[PDB]
Each structure stands twice: as C-alpha cells, then as structure tokens.
UniProtKB/Swiss-Prot annotation:
Function: May be involved in photosynthetic membrane biogenesis.
UniProt family annotation: Belongs to the THF1 family.
UniProt keyword terms in alphabetical order: Coiled coil
Protein's UniProt name: Protein Thf1
Biological processes per GO annotation: photosystem II assembly
GO terms under cellular component: plasma membrane-derived thylakoid photosystem II
Native species: Thermosynechococcus vestitus (strain NIES-2133 / IAM M-273 / BP-1)
The keyword Secreted appears for this protein: no
Sequence intervals crossing the membrane: none
Length: 186
C-alpha cells in the first residue's frame, strides 16, 4: 500500500534542490492533505479540486525564493501524488471562461440543471475538502468584482443552489483568508 512516506520520497526524488524549512513545512502539509484525500473512498477528483490545489499552492508560494524553482516544485508535488501537473493546470485555467460574469448568470446556468464544465463541479457530492472552498473562492474571483467583495451575500445565494456545504466553505475561507500572511511571520 502506498503511504505518505512513499509520496514524500517521490517528491524529493523529483525535486532535489534545496527548499527552505518554512516552505518544506507548507509543501509537506499539502502532500499529506492530498494523499489522505486520494485514499478516501468517497473522494473523486474534479476541476474544483484542481483549482483549489493550484490556488492554495500559488498563494503560499507567492514569495518563494528561489522563484525559478516554483514550477519544478509544483510538478514534483503532482507526480508524487499520482496526478498530472498539466491536467491540474489546464483544469484550473478552464475556469477563466467565466471571467466577468455576474453571479446571476452563473445561478441561471446551475439552475438549468446542465451546467457547463467546469462549473458543473460546483455540484460536488462525495468527500469535501477545504481545498474545494479555496477553489470556489478562486472561481468567484473571476466573476464580476462585486462578487468576492460581498462574499457573504454570494455564499448565501449559492447555499440553496449547490450541494457543496456552504457553512463549511465559510469556515474554511475565513481560516484561509485570515492566515494569508502567517508564512511571512516568525
């Protein structure tokens, strides 16, 4: 059975250059989190998870130095998790087709019952991660700027429409947002 230890060894075999301790802590926490999702019988990859992994990684790595290693680290992280970094990157990018839209047009597409991909991945059943909350926030950021300024109102509008558990999303986004600067502190 493949263990977290196997995943970490794969990571360090794929990226051998030094990583500062501050960032090894964040990267290993992410490696563990993804591994534990994959072993969960109720978890199924979707573009919402992809977007969340890419967003979370990009945010904690925004100050990473040496910056030229950041893409190699992402590659290594994905292959260590038996994922394809190019698939995650394309799935994250696929949300950009929603750029500018008001929330009303998104709701209309959900309510049609046959939303396009990747919007359809907001109809999330099976195992929920905080990464899916991160992913939702990144999507909402593509929409009309109104939407994430009034995050409260937006989340409340989504709650009767999608099965993603919006009370856990609120919780997880408050944590994520409140902790943006912690990696820059002692």
């Amino acid at each position: 059975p493949r263990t977290v230890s196997d995943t970490k060894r794969a990571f360090y075999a794929a990226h051998t250059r030094p990583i500062h301790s501050i960032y090894r802590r964040f990267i290993e926490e992410l490696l563990v989190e993804i591994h534990l999702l994959r072993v969960n019988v109720d978890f199924r990859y979707s573009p919402l998870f992809a977007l969340g992994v890419v967003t979370a990684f990009d945010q904690f790595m925004e100050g990473y130095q040496p910056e030229g290693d950041r893409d190699r680290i992402f590659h290594a992280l994905c292959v260590a998790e038996e994922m394809n970094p190019q698939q995650l990157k394309e799935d994250a990018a696929s949300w950009q087709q929603y750029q500018g839209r008001p929330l009303s047009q998104i709701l209309d597409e959900l309510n049609s019952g046959q939303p396009s991909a990747p919007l359809n991945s907001l109809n999330h059943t099976g195992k929920y991660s905080r990464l899916h909350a991160v992913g939702l926030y990144a999507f909402l950021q593509e929409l009309a700027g109104e939407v994430t300024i009034h995050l409260n109102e937006t989340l409340d509008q989504l709650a009767p429409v999608i099965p993603l558990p919006i009370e856990k999303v609120k919780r997880d986004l408050e944590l994520y947002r409140s902790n943006l600067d912690k990696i820059n502190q002692a």
